[PDB]
Amino acid sequence: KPWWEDEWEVPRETLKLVERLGAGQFGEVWMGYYNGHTKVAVKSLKQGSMSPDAFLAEANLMKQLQHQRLVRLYAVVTQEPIYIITEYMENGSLVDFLKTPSGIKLTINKLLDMAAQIAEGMAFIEERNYIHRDLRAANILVSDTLSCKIADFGLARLIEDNEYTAREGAKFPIKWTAPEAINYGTFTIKSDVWSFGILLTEIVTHGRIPYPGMTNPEVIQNLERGYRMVRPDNCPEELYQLMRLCWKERPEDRPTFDYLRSVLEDFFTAT
Template sequence: MRKHFYPQEVEKIQLTRRHSYRESLGSLGGFPRDLVVLTSDLGLSMVWNKLWSRAPGMGCVFCKKLEPGAKEDGGLEGDFRNYGAADRYGPDPTQSRPASSFSHIPNYNSFSPQPASPAFLDAGTIRGISGIGVTMFIALYDYEARTEDDLTFTKGEKFHILNNTEGDWWEARSLSSGHTGYIPSNYVAPVDSIQAEEWYFGKIGRKDAERQLLSPGNSRGAFLIRESETTKGAYSLSIRDWDQTRGDHVKHYKIRKLDTGGYYITTRAQFDTVQELVQHYLEVNDGLCHLLTAACTTMKPQTLGLAKDAWEISRSSITLEHRLGTGCFGDVWLGTWNGSTKVAVKTLKPGTMSPKAFLAEAQIMKLLRHDKLVQLYAVVSEEPIYIVTEFMCHGSLLEFLKGPEGHVLKLPHLVDMAAQVAEGMAYMERMNYIHRDLRAANILVGERLVCKIADFGLARLIEDDEYNPQQGTKFPIKWTAPEAALFCRFTIKSDVWSFGILITELITKGRVPYPGMNNREVLEQVEHGYHMPCPPGCPASLYEVMEQTWRLDPEERPTFEYLQSFLEDYFTSTEPQYQPGDDT
């Protein structure tokens, strides 16, 4: 149960096009001092402040210096909602599932119905589990033990689950070796379940299915099956195809469910299980665009954390191997944890932020889990602070765009990268979390041009006079919405503004926004409605959406959900998204 306490009226300022931002500030009266959200399920207390102050000629200075006794600003726009979305490879949608909650993962040892989704996971996140009362699981991937408490295992190895009530790492006994230890829960699935099939990709979207099937290693006839985005209890079959007109592309077919429990693509060919349907189309195309040839290749997923209870780690467990980059507040290193696991390590200069405030924010950040967010693995909470995350092989999007690989990227690749960022931000939008520093430098690129959002929420914690829009040189003015720069009013809508600037970085291959203008000129111009002109090579329809993200009234800017949909479908042809089965 959540309880909300509003000490004063939640908002007394209206920013509209009829009033300039400075006029609005002048009319500012009382405002909420603290917004406390108590979530008993999580055992967390999160406090927000709305701190405002005036500066000559600028309307508002950035609120980094706290008043005596004031509490620190929070990173969430609101509280986490209990969406309880299924895992990426979530439970079989044909099974009935109780409403999700913030409780732990289902306890398969107790045989009592419990929620089937780990807390805070969203669609497209991890390969998961299903089945109440199931204790026999099979490995989906190879895994090399990282600690003496882990089990090393190979794909196909079977386990008896002894305890899965303590988070993302389960205690299990290997049936082949007899050894007992911890295993990552997203590396296994119930034996003989659809989740254990190589071709089952669970709850991923149509666009993500296309990305994966068109990636290297797949040929014509490669396929996957996923949960239907539109029909509960149904599935979709996605197949890689080729023709002279379109070249390599992907076609999608709906797998419908019969009232009697069977499945079909065409009414003349019906099957008791999805597995039987797949086997049929492996032998004959029977109206499909191509015979099914092989399951889509997939990359081994990141584990959920480095190991069991590996959150606040010792500095000695990290080996810094070589520096990947240097920023205003610290360095980024390629490192190794515990001599076994490659990681990225952000080292912060002492005094950059309060260790106590950072640790509190990190406790929230680690709950954000999505394929398009860089996973926070662990922290060293004493100064100098270490932030340990998954390693992304191509580094920042900004440097990637400037390099030789980025130079050859065409518009479809650039739009797809923007769509991936929008997907990650749409997740943060649903979770009511604000990034505050969204730009190409804070997007990381991995294998297969996968883009993930990094450094979300950290900007709020920086304690540096230079990180100030009025005087400082370190503050990213050119990416910041005017209400955020002038009034410190950061919301998901100010992130939308920043996303529009990020698109210009993509189109121009890393050019600094507002070329020829300094920060003060930018701040003055955008306050009066100035927009960057359409970049060379940018289609008018894409620029129109960029202009929508730069509307002065934050409420008139589009949502990230809309931006994701627009960008994912930007190059979609007029043919149907789903192919009809033959003779249906």
């Protein structure tokens, strides 16, 4: 749909970039203001850094997937520099936030709450026949009321039937990624479940990197032995066992995200 005909296209002058939140090979992310009063996040493409088509593919994706638990697309400036404008999450990244004085004082009760919120947002994605493919604490954003939303859909995909096969030449975080997606390049919603498992250790340890003390090769090597990650410290055994359902060897044995949400909400309302 043409920009002059697009409902998401906005005049670059409606925007006011105020503070850089981060800069990368491909552009920057800013906090700014839309039409004066509304705080937004803005992500701009570095001309040259990559394809405008590739950059925008993410925003187009977010036109379809909308939900209180997913970060909301606001608008695009589809002329250079190109902008993607989203709602602004005040506490930023979950992984950063958990290391703060505030997140550090977070009770296990609240942490299980946050985890049920992330599972819930993944449930919506699940039923819409999407996979995320990059699920980990870094890609979860925290609002000023301490609620959680899934972000970053650059790698997300619709699944025509069953699964997605990656190309010969794509890499993924080895520690968050399900074996089958490492070995055969095959992704399903069920390997997002694996990642949600690593994400939970990432939560209960207030941000610590999964598989402490281990290199990627060691991790791969131990998983093939049937070993899974060692119980994180101060991890309720109820919770540790849930992570283990996520790390089932056969993909189809791993639970649904709606199941996960149910269980986590039982844990939460229990404590």
